[PDB]
Amino acid sequence: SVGLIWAQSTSGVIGRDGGIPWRLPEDLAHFKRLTMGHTVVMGRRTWDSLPAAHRPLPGRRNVVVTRQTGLVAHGAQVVGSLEQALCPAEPDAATWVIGGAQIYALALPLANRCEVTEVDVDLPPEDEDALAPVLDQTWAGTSGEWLVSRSGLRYRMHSYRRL
Ligand SMILES: NC(=O)c1ccc[n+]([C@@H]2O[C@H](COP(=O)([O-])OP(=O)(O)OC[C@H]3O[C@@H](n4cnc5c(N)ncnc54)[C@H](OP(=O)(O)O)[C@@H]3O)[C@@H](O)[C@H]2O)c1
Numbered sequence: 001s002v003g004l005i006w007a008q009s010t011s012g013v014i015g016r017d018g019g020i021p022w023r024l025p026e027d028l029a030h031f032k033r034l035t036m037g038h039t040v041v042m043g044r045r046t047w048d049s050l051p052a053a054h055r056p057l058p059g060r061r062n063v064v065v066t067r068q069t070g071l072v073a074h075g076a077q078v079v080g081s082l083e084q085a086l087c088p089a090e091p092d093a094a095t096w097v098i099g100g101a102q103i104y105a106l107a108l109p110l111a112n113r114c115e116v117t118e119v120d121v122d123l124p125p126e127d128e129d130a131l132a133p134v135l136d137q138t139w140a141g142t143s144g145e146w147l148v149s150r151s152g153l154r155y156r157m158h159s160y161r162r163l
């Protein structure tokens with residue numbers, strides 16, 4: 001059972017300049033509470049984006065997807081494909097794919113659930129932005145209320161499952 005979790009602007013941006021182009025503390029906490037104790041699978045660029053205090057993500061089995069044989073990621077397991085990341089030698093009840101855009105595109109066909117935070121932030125996309133996957137008619141979801149962060153941004157959480 002594979003889930004994706006991401007935060008996006010309404011416009012669909014998830015990444016810019018090697019990070020996330022908004023600050024939303026309530027969603028960071030939501031991410032931490034949903035993923036704690038589970039396996040988290042990420043692309044190498046997202047692994048490289050994690051700040052030092054969060055690399056590896058504490059309390060989770062970190063799995064990093066790269067084509068670089070010989071890459072060592074201290075505190076994480078390095079695999080050569082997303083299929084490899086989803087065929088662990090020791091199974092986990094819950095596996096969360098935590099980005100980024102390249103890995104989400106690879107994982108979406110294999111996933112049954114998406115947990116999406118929508119951030120009402122005006123972010124005209126730029127050439128090198130990382131963008132969210134698009135959910136087609138094979139996905140249906142439920143939406144929480146629009147909430148306002150202590151920082152001022154409107155946000156809301158969506159929970160999608162494969163039909
Ligand atoms: N808002 C959010 O929820 C969220 C979540 C996660 C990340 N982000 C942001 O998204 C950005 C990073 O995303 P990204 O799309 O640039 O990169 P990414 O998906 O995290 O990683 C891309 C890397 O994955 C590896 N890879 C891709 N396809 C592969 C395949 N088929 N087999 C093996 N390895 C494969 C490659 O590593 P090698 O080059 O090493 O071969 C590739 O360079 C950052 O700005 C980050 O902060 C945002």
Ligand SMILES: Nc1nc(N)c2c(n1)CN(C(=O)COc1ccccc1N1CCC(C(=O)O)CC1)C2
Nearest residue numbers: 005006007024027028031032051054057098099117
């Ligand atoms: N895939 C996915 N989905 C989401 N909904 C969210 C995310 N990523 C990331 N989010 C944020 O708001 C932003 O995060 C961070 C941003 C900048 C620096 C550190 C962090 N974090 C510190 C604590 C770390 C941990 O210990 O987990 C995680 C990263 C929500």
